[PDB]
Amino acid sequence: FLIRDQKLGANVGSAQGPTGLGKYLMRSPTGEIIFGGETMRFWDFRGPWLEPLRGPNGLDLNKIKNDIQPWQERRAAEYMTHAPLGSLNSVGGVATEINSVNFVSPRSWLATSHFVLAFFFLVGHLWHAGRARAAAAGFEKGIDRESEPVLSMPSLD
């Protein structure tokens, strides 16, 4: 959109958005020029297609103003329309979208599957480690009816 509107004659550098922050370009907390909008949270993104626009202070208003290349415009368009948003039944887009584009980013599949596995394994850890410590000292099958440890300890009450 900075690319689009700029072609319609808009001066991206000085555009003021609803909040008075900068429709297309704003500053990060440490001073660098970044893209505006909720996208202010991703100002740490670096990528082949976008780097040639970065200057020593972040996005350079001159390059953005006349060095944007077509392959970049279509790269940005491609990636924009292929964000990692989708449903279980594989319906690419936002939860309110319509059926048609059957797609769910490989990055979403991989990431979720492995967080589940990664997780359950941490439970697995706790479980097998808890068993091993009781097994060793030797009580992983119950408290000795006879010698019940707690019963030999002073009352804290």
Partner: peptide, 12 residues
Amino acid sequence: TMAFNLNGFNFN
């Protein structure tokens, strides 16, 4: 899981 945008069924 929905933290990586793999959301609920979309039967729209």
